[PDB]
Design a protein around this ligand. Structure first.
Ligand SMILES: Nc1ncnc2c1ncn2[C@@H]1O[C@H](COP(=O)(O)OP(=O)(O)OP(=O)(O)OP(=O)(O)OP(=O)(O)OC[C@H]2O[C@@H](n3cnc4c(N)ncnc43)[C@H](O)[C@@H]2O)[C@@H](O)[C@H]1O
Ligand SMILES: [Ca+2]
Ligand SMILES: [Mg+2]
Ligand SMILES: [Zn+2]
Length: 215
């Protein structure tokens, strides 16, 4: 189960990754989550990534390819893996193809989760995360019982630094410009599958399960 989840910022990649990883027991490899964890602890990966992440720009290829190479080399990826938000450039895609061909693997599906830009803007600006447990909420789409507070543990919710409207707009632009060529690269291999991300979370997952259960 060698899978990539691709989509504009906000499309639900992390939401579906958690589902796939829970059901199929394959590692969750999210470059965004890896950068963010590094930035929080101020490691040298974090420091180098931070300026790009704050600006809504893509971290440079070599760095990104590096953390993915290191991650794939671990023994938990022998049965499959879920790459969430990588690749994001055609250079990353070609690098990955090379890494996997040496590992005697190929990508089985690249899943493009499609959502209109107005709802993406709303998803990102309204997302809130628990500072205690990391549970994600949304102001309108899945609100806590008490505003600003986690249902599970009473912890105070926070907003990511890049989820403000200005930086969301830049993120959408930056990622949309990369997208057509990346889609084409995978469509030419005929491994690209498009899923309508405007469905509820379980119905999106059900559409993914209809293909992934074959692996
Ligand atoms: N390969 C690469 N190369 C270069 N640089 C890289 C890189 N990868 C990362 N980076 C750098 O790292 C930065 C951070 O990347 P990253 O952290 O990966 O951010 P992103 O791709 O912009 O998207 P998000 O995590 O914000 O969105 P998501 O699609 O995971 O949606 P989520 O499920 O959270 O959902 C969003 C919200 O919507 C809600 N939602 C989800 N599904 C649904 C649904 N079905 N209906 C309604 N609401 C839903 C959720 O509850 C939540 O509130 C990048 O901007 C870049 O600088
Ligand atoms: Ca919807
Ligand atoms: Mg994410
Ligand atoms: Zn919590």
């Amino acid at each position: 189960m060698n899978i990539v989840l691709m989509g504009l910022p906000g499309a639900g990649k992390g939401t579906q990754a958690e589902r796939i990883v829970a059901k199929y027991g394959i590692p969750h490899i999210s470059t965004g989550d890896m950068f963010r964890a590094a930035m929080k602890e101020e490691t040298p990966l974090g420091l180098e990534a931070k300026s790009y992440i704050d600006k809504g720009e893509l971290v440079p290829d070599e760095v990104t390819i590096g953390i993915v190479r290191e991650r794939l080399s671990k023994s938990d990826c022998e049965r499959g893996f879920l790459l969430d938000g990588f690749p994001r450039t055609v250079a990353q895609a070609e690098a990955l193809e090379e890494i996997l061909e040496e590992m005697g693997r190929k990508l089985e599906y690249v899943i493009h989760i499609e959502v209109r830009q107005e709802e993406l803007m709303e998803r990102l600006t309204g997302r809130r995360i628990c500072s205690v447990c990391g549970t994600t909420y949304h102001l309108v789409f899945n609100p806590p019982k008490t505003p600003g507070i986690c249902d599970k543990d009473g912890g105070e919710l926070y907003q990511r630094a890049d989820d403000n409207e200005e930086t969301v707009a830049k993120r959408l632009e930056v990622n949309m410009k990369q997208m057509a060529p990346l889609l084409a690269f995978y469509d030419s291999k005929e491994v690209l599958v498009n899923v309508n991300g405007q469905q509820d979370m379980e119905k999106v997952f059900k559409d993914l399960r209809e293909i992934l259960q074959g692996l």
